[PDB]
């Protein structure tokens, strides 16, 4: 058949313990020096399209 197979159901406890590292880390959001919508460090502000001057359209 399907050669190595689990021997016993993994308990609600054991299953959950394994998920103690699955939690997403929230982005470190910065506020744009211009358009004043929040942005990602080292990226162009989505809203105004600025990164010192304006690079992207809108």
């Amino acid at each position: 058949a399907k050669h190595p197979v689990p021997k016993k159901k993994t308990s609600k406890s054991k299953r959950d313990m394994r998920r103690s590292h699955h939690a997403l880390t929230a982005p470190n959001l910065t506020e744009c020096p211009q358009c004043h919508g929040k942005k990602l460090s080292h990226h162009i502000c989505p809203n105004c399209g600025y990164y010192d001057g304006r690079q992207v359209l809108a």
Binding site: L40, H42, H43, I44, P46, Y51, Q55, V56
Partner: protein
């Protein structure tokens, strides 16, 4: 280990096709939006292309034609762009990071000259 120093993600032929492909795009358009990595690999190949063109002689032209298979882009690079870069000690390529895509979730970037 692997202390080499280059970067592919396809087969020999393809790595060269992509390089030349995007190099023609940037040189023709002046600014292209692509994947970050893809853009990173492009930066030196295109930067090296400008230096060849910065020769001005037929050989320098013919050398560019080995990578740029567009009759017009080769003229744009030879006669227009390379001369404008005359006193720039190499460096005209800048990469800005735009931000994550929907499908693959890939972080996009801009590359302009």
């Amino acid at each position: 280990h692997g202390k080499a120093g280059r970067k592919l993600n396809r087969n020999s032929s393809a790595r060269v096709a992509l390089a030349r492909a995007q190099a023609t795009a940037l040189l023709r358009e002046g600014r292209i939006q692509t994947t970050l990595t893809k853009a990173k690999e492009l930066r030196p190949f295109v930067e090296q292309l400008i230096t060849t063109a910065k020769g001005g002689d037929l050989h320098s032209r013919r050398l560019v034609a080995q990578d740029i298979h567009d009759k017009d882009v080769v003229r744009k690079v030879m006669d227009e762009v390379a001369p404008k870069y005359a006193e720039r000690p190499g460096g005209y390529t800048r990469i800005l990071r735009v931000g994550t895509r929907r499908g693959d979730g890939v972080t996009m970037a801009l590359i302009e000259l």
